[PDB]
Coordinates of N, CA, C and O in Angstrom, one line a residue:
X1 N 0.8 -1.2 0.0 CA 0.0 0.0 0.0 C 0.8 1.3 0.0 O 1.2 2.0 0.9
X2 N 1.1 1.3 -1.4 CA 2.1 3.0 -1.5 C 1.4 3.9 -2.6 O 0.6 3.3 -3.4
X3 N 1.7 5.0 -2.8 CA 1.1 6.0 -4.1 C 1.7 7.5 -4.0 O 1.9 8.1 -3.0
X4 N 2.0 7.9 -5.1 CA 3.3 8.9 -5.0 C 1.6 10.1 -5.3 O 0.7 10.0 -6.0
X5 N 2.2 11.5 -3.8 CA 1.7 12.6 -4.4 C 1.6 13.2 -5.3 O 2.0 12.7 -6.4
X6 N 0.9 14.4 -5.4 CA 1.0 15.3 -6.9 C 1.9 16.4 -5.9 O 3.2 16.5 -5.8
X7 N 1.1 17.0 -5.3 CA 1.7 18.3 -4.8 C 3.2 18.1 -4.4 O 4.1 19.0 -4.4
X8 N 3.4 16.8 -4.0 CA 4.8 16.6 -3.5 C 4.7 17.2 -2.0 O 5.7 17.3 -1.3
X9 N 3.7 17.6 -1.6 CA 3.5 17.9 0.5 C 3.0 16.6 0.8 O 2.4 15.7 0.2
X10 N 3.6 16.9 2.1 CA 3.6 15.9 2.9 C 3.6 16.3 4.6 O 4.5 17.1 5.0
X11 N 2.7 15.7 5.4 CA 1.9 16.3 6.5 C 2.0 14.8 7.5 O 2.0 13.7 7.1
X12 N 2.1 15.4 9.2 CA 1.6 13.9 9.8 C 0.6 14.3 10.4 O 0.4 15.5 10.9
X13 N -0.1 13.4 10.4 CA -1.6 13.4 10.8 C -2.6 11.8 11.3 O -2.9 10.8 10.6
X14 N -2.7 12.1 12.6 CA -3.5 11.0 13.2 C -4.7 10.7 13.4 O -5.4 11.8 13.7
X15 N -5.4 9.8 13.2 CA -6.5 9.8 13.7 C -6.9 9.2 14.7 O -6.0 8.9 15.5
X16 N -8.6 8.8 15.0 CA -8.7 8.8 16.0 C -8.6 6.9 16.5 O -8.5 6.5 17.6
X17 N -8.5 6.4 15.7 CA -8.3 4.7 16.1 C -6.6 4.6 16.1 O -6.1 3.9 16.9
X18 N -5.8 5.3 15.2 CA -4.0 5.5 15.1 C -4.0 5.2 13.9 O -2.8 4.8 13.6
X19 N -4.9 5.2 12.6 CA -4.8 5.1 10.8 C -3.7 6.9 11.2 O -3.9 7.8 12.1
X20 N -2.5 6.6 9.9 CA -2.3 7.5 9.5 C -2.6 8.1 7.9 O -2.9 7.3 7.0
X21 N -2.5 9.5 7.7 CA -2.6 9.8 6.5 C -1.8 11.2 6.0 O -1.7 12.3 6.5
X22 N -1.4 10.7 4.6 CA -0.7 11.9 4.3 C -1.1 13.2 4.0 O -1.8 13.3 3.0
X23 N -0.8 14.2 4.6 CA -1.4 15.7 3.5 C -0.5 16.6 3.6 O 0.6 16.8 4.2
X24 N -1.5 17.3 2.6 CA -0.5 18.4 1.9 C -0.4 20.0 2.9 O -1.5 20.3 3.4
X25 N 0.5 20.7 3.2 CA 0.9 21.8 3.6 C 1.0 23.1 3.0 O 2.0 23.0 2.2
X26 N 0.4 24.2 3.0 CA 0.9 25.3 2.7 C 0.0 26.2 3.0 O -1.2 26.0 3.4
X27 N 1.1 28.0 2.9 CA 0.2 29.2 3.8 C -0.8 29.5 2.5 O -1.7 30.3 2.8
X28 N -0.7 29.0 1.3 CA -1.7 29.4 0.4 C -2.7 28.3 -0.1 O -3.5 28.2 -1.0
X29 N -2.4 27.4 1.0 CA -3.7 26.0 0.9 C -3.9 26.0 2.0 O -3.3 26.3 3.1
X30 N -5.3 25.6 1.6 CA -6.5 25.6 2.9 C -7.0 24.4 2.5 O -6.6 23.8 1.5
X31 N -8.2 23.8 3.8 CA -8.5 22.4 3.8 C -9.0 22.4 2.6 O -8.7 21.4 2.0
X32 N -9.7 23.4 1.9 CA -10.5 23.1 0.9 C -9.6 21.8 0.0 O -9.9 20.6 0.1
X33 N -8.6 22.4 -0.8 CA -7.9 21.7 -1.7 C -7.2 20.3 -0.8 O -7.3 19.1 -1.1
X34 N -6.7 21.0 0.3 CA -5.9 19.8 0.9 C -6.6 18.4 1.3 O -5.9 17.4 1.6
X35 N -8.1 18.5 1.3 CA -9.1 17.6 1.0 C -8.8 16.6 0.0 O -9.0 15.4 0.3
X36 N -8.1 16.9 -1.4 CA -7.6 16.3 -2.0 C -6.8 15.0 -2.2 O -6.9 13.9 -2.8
X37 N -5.7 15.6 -1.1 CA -4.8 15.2 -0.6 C -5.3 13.7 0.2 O -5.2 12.7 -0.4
X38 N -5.6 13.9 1.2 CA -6.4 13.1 2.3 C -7.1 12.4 2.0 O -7.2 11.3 2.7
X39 N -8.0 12.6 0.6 CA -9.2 12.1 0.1 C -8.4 10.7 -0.7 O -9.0 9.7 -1.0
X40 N -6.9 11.0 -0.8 CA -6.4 9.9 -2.0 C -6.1 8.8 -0.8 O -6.2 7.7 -1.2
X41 N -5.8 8.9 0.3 CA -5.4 8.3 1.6 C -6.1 7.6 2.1 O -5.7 6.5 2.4
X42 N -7.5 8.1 2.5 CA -8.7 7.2 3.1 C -9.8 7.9 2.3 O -10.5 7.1 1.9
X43 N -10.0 8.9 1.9 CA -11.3 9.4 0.9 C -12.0 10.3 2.1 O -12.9 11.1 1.8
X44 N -11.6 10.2 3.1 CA -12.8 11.4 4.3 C -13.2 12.5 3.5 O -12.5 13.3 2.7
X45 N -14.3 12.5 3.8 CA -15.0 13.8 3.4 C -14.6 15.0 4.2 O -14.5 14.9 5.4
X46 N -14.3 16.4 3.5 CA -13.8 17.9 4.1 C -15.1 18.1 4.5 O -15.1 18.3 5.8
X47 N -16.4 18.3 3.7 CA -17.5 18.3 4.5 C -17.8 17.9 6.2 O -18.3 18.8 7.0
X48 N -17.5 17.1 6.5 CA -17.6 16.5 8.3 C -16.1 16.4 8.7 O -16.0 16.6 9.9
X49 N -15.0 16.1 8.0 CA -13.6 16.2 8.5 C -13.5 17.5 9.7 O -14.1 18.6 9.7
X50 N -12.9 17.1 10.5 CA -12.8 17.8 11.9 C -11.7 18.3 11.6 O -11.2 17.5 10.8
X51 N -10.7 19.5 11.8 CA -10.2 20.3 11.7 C -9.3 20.2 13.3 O -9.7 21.1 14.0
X52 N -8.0 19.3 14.1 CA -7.6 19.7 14.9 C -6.0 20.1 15.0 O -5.1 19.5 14.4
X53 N -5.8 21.3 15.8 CA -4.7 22.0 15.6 C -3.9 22.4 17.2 O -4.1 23.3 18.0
X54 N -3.0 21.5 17.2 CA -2.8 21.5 18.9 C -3.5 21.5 20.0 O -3.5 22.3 21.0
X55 N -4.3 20.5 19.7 CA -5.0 19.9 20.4 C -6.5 20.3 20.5 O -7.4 19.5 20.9
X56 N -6.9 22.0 20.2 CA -7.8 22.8 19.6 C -8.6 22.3 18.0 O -8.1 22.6 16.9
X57 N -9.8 21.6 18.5 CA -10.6 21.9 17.0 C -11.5 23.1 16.6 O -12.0 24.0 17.4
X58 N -11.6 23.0 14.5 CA -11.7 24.2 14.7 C -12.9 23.7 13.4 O -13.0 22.5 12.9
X59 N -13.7 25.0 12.9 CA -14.6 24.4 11.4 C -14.2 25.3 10.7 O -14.1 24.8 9.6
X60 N -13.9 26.3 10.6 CA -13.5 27.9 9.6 C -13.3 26.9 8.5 O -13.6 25.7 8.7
X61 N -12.9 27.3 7.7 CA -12.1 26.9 6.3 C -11.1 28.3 5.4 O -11.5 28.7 4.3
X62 N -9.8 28.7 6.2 CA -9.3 29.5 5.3 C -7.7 29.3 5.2 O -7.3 28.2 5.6
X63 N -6.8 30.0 4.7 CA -5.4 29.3 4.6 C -4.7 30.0 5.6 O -5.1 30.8 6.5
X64 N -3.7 29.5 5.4 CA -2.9 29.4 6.9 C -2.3 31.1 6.9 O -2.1 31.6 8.0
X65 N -2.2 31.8 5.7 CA -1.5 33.3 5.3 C -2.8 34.1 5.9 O -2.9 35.0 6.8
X66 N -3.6 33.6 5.4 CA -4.9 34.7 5.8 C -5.9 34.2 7.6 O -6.7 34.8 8.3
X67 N -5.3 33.0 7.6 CA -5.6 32.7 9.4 C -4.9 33.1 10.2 O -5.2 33.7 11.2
X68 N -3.4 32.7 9.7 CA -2.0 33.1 10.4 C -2.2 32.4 11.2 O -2.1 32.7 12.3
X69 N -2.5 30.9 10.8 CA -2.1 29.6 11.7 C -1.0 28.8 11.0 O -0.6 28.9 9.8
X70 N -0.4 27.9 12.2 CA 0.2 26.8 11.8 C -0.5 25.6 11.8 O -1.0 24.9 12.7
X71 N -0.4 25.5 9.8 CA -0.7 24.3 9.9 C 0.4 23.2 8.9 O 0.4 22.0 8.7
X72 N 1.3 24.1 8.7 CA 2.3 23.3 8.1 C 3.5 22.6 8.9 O 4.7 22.4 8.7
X73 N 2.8 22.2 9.9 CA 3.9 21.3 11.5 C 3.3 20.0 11.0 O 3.4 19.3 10.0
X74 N 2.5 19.9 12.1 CA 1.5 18.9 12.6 C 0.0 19.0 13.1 O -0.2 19.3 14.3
X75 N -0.9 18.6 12.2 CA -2.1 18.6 12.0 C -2.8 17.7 11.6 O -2.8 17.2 10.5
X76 N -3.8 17.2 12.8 CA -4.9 15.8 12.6 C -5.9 16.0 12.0 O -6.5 16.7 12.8
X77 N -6.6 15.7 10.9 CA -8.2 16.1 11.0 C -7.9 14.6 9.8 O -7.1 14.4 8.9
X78 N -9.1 13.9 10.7 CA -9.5 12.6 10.3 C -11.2 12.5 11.2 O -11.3 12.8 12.4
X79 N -12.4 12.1 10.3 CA -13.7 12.1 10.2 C -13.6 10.5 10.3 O -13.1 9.9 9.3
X80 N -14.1 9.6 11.7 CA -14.3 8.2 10.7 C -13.5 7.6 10.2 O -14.0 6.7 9.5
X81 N -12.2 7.6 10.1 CA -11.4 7.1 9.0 C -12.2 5.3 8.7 O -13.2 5.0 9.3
X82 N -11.4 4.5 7.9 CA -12.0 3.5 7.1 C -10.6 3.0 6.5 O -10.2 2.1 7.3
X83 N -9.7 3.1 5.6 CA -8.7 2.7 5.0 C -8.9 2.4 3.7 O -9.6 1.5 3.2
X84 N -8.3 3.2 3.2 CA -8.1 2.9 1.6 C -7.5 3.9 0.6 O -7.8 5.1 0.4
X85 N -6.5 3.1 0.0 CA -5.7 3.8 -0.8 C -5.1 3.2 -2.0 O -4.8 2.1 -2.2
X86 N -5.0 4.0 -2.7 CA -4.2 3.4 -4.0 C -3.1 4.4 -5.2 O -2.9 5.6 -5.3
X87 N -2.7 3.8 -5.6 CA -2.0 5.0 -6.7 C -3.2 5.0 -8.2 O -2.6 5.7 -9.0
X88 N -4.4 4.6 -8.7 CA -4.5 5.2 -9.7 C -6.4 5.4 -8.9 O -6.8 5.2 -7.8
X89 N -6.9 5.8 -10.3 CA -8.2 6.4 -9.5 C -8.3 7.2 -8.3 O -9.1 6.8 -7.5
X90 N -7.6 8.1 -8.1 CA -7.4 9.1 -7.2 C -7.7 10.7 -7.5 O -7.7 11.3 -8.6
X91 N -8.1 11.5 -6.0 CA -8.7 13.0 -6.5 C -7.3 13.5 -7.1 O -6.4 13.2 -6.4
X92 N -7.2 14.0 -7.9 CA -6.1 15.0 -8.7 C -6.3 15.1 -9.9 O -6.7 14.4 -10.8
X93 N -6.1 16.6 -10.0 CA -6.4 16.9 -11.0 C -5.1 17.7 -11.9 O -4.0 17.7 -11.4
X94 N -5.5 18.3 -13.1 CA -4.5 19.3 -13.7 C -4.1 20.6 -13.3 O -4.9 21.5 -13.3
X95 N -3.2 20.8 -12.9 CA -2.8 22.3 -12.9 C -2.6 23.4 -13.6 O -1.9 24.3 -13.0
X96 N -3.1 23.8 -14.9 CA -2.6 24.1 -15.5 C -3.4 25.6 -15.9 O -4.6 25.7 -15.7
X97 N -2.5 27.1 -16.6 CA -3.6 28.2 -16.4 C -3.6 28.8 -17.7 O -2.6 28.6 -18.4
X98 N -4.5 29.4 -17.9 CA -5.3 29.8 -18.9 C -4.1 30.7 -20.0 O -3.0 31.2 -19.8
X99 N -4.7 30.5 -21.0 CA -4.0 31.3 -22.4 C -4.4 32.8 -22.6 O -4.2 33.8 -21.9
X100 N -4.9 32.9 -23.6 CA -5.5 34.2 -24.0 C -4.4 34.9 -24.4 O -4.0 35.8 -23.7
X101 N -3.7 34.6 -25.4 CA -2.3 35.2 -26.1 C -2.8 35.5 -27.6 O -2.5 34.7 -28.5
X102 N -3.5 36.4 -27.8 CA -3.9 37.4 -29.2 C -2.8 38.1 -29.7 O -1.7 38.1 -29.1
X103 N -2.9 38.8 -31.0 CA -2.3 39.3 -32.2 C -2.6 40.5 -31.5 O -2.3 41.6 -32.1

């Protein structure tokens, strides 16, 4: 049971039985996207995913630049976990940004 990131972040994070799961870090990602992440690990839904941060949970949803939290240490938020993972059929998508290069 292995599967290589996209973002290339990498997070420790416990849950509440001792499943771990990987996720992604940054002051310009928020759970929103980092849902992603998590979601390739066990699939938890961001919708009910619990949000805990030194021992403090939280529900907001915004990035760590505009909360001015740390969340790129160590951070748990695991809903339920269940187990399941793989490398293909996973959330990820393209990165890629728009054109619009005229004469």
């Amino acid at each position: 049971g292995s599967l290589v990131p996209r973002g290339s972040m990498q997070i420790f994070v416990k849950t509440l039985t001792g499943k771990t799961i990987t996720l992604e870090v940054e002051p310009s990602d928020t759970i929103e996207n980092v849902k992603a992440k998590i979601q390739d690990k066990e699939g938890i839904p961001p919708d009910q995913q619990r949000l805990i941060f030194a021992g403090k949970q939280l529900e907001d949803g915004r990035t760590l630049s505009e909360y001015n939290i740390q969340k790129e240490s160590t951070l748990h938020l695991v809903l339920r976990l269940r187990g399941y993972a793989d490398l293909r059929e996973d959330p990820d998508r393209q990165d890629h940004h728009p054109g619009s290069g005229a004469q």
